[model samples]
Target chain A: YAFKIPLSIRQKICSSLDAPNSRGNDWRLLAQKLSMDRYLNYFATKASPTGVILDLWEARQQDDGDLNSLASALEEMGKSEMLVAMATDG
Target chain B: AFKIPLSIRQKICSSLDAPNSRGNDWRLLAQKLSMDRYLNYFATKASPTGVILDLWEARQDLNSLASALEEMGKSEMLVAMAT
Candidate 1:
């Protein structure tokens, strides 16, 4: 498959992983650190907006057979987890 | 357009090839790959979602931070900019 192949871009991203914070713009790294927490839901709801916890909660409200939303939410969470795994592996 | 030194590039490539064989940590590796000043920003902000697309915002954030470090971390930074 022919891809744009952002080698330069990728190299840049890899470099940032090791840099330090100087200016007041350090919040970005803080957010990334917070995301490391596996159970981010219990501590913070904002991160995992479409995870299983929220999906199950939303599902309970529906009495009818409208589970499509819940299903979608779960699907997103699953995909997100997979991405995390790949990033860590690399 | 750019030239990477053979010795240094080989070191980096070899490290990447085995990666965990020596029980190395990717997060730590990523940190070292970054310049001194940018490490804090990366450790704190870069989400490292592995690949882009799935979570563009977080992934891009990390990419931005890492890319900055990579460019600055190169040994050629000082020599090339000495104009």
Candidate 2:
């Protein structure tokens, strides 16, 4: 099944991730720092950015507390705008 | 200058030189980055236009310097400089 992520929201997410050493390359670092290298790496290499986002969303829905911490890190790094946009759009 | 991965540079070059069958231009590169699976899924729920634009914009940003170099026929400068 396909997913729909609005441009406005995508832009918001990209805005946070656009920097060279920010979300793009830093995700690996973030994962390592958070001790979620395995989990994050799974999606990082296997999924598209949006795919990873949706996977995280699904994990959160399943009450995966680890994702909450992951979410918090994304927010701290300013990548949570898309999360808010998705929630608001929903 | 910030160094971009060679793999990404290759994608940008391919996007600029060869558009997809639909002649959608940069959309092919965007799809490569966003991935066909996510875009196929996204198309079902929301207009793919926005995502396409977003991806295209990101691609342009990533390729801005290289694009300029290519125009100057100095594209190899990137590899040389980065190296």
What's the lDDT for all of these models? 0.32, 0.46
* Winning model by DockQ: 2
lDDT of 2 by residue, A20-42 (tens): 45654454545554443434434
For candidate 2, lDDT tens digit of each residue in B1-83?
12345565454444444425234433343354444434443344333433343334433455554454455454455565456
RMSD of 2: 12.2
Q: List-wise, what DockQ does each model earn?
A: 0.01, 0.04
TM-score of each: 0.18, 0.31
Candidate 1 lDDT tens digits, B1-83: 12334454344434433435333422444444332222232233333212111222222243443353355353342243332
Q: Residue A72: error of model 2 in Å?
A: 1.6
- Residue B45 lDDT, candidate 1, scale 0-100: 32
lDDT of 1 by residue, A6-62 (tens): 344334332332234322222133233323223322223234322322222332333
